[PDB]
């Protein structure tokens, strides 16, 4: 693989908070969106060059936000762009500056910095995580909130939607994880002692954990045994099967490639393996389902704390964003990670 670092300021040297690829992409060219302090959401055009190095092309600027933006999300179909930040307003952008975007529905109801947003598989239900100690469930078609989860007692910095559409995983600054069944709309599981995670001293504003694309396992970064990343299962969410050791800086981001790779210690037993990316404050570790040890590791590429990572639709691009105003990409050749199913 190859690593290319963006040495040109995307948002006029302001720290970058989020990155997301167009899930609706299905070819070689992928669309990437960035969020920064400059109150602008920049969607870029990312594609491999003749030498295989990633190339970034600016497409649109989205300055509707009055204040800074911390999280940007695309729909699983890629149609609608979710963007919220300091002004605490969730915008559903849509393709109506090389291109233009327009907000469809204003999903207001949050108070301050919104840190994590997750798209449901159907695309019609929203999970929003913000500092305000709550997670709100929304209707995309209706544009209105329908459920409230106020059990968080500290800064909510990470949330993900179960691909099977049964539970909701949340990570807050209180070193406490809260699981909400999508049917009962109440707390199904709660784990705080094995502390279990890192305290407020960890310097990342995000605690973004994500389910496995099949939903069988949950990957929770920023754990303490030293910094680690615990793994749970649908069979038992109250005890970790294993944790990924990351001594030094604390892990802050977990992203899984949406491409199922064939099998080439094993975390989970199914005929397919999934490659996921974990980003710490200054290091990125690349694991897979079958191998306990990581098969990839990139570090010393950004001058400040990393903020977000994102996989491409085909898995050929792995964007990395930091808080120094610069981003980076990881480029894999044809099926370098593995043979897709």
């Amino acid at each position: 693989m190859k690593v290319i670092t963006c040495e040109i300021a995307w948002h006029n040297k302001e720290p970058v908070y989020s990155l997301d690829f167009q899930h609706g992409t299905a070819g070689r060219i992928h669309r990437l969106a960035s969020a920064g302090v400059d109150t602008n959401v920049r969607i870029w055009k990312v594609e491999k060059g003749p030498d295989g190095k990633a190339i970034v092309e600016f497409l649109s600027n989205l300055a509707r936000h009055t204040k800074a933006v911390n999280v940007v999300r695309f729909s699983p179909t890629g149609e609608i762009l979710a963007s919220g930040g300091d002004d605490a307003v969730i915008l559903l952008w849509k393709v109506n500056n090389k291109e233009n975007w327009t907000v469809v529905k204003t999903l207001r109801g949050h108070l301050e910095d919104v840190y994590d947003i997750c798209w449901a598989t159907d695309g019609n239900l929203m999970a929003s995580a913000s500092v305000d100690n709550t997670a709100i469930i929304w209707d995309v078609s209706k544009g209105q909130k329908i459920s409230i989860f106020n059990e968080h007692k500290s800064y909510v910095q990470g949330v993900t939607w179960d691909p099977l559409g049964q539970y909701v995983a949340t990570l807050s600054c209180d070193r406490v994880l809260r699981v909400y069944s999508i049917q009962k709309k109440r707390v199904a599981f709660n784990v705080s002692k094995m502390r279990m995670f890192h305290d407020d001293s960890m310097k990342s504003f995000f605690r973004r954990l994500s389910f496995t694309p099949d939903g069988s396992l949950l990957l929770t970064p920023a754990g303490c045994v030293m910094n680690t990343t615990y793994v749970f299962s649908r069979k038992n969410l109250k005890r970790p099967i294993a944790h990924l050791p990351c001594p030094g800086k604390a892990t802050l981001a977990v992203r899984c490639c949406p491409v199922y790779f064939e099998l080439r210690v094993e975390l989970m037993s199914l005929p397919y393996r999934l490659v996921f990316a974990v980003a710490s404050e200054d290091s990125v570790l690349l694991y897979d389902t079958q191998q306990s040890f990581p098969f990839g590791y990139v570090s010393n590429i950004h001058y400040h704390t990393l903020s977000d990572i994102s996989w491409s639709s085909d898995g050929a691009f792995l964007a990395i964003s930091s808080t120094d105003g610069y981003c980076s990409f990881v480029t894999f050749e044809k099926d370098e990670l593995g043979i897709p199913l």
Binding site: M1, S292, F293, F295, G296, Y297, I301, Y303
Partner: peptide, 20 residues
């Protein structure tokens, strides 16, 4: 300034996973 140290694809041991 920073001194970049890059490790290629070796099919490190400081990060070997320990099970429970």
């Amino acid at each position: 300034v920073l001194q970049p140290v890059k490790i290629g694809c070796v099919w490190l041991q400081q990060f070997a996973a320990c099970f429970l």
